[PDB]
Fold this protein.
Amino acid sequence: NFQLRDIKDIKNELIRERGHLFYSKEFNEAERLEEAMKQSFSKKKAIEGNEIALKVLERYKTIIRETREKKEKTNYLKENIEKYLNDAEANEAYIWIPLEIDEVNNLYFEATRKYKNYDLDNALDMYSKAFNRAQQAAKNAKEAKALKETDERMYKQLKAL
């Protein structure tokens, strides 16, 4: 099981991940319930307080578990965006599809502004759009490149032979 200290520690960790900022509503709610538990204990009702305390622990654990989950998903999308933007830049993307590359850089930027305003959910949506368009960008860069190689390789033969 657990004790009073257990909450101190979980709550400390949650603050350390800025859980209270990413989920300020659910954090106000768990803090209101922590008060209730404190009244219980001070009014000498250990069973009632302990019954509330098991909940406060789980309300606090949810906030970190989900903060962590989306943090990890967020920086997976980030690393993959840079990976496919590389693959696209390697395939002449600033020749054939430069404005497609700008859109991605812009989506990624605006997603980071959302992330910094502690809006994990909308931040993740725009990082997912940016991801989808990095994939699409990498593809269109290859297809475009391959097309140019074919057209100039025909056209060399025609104009001489």
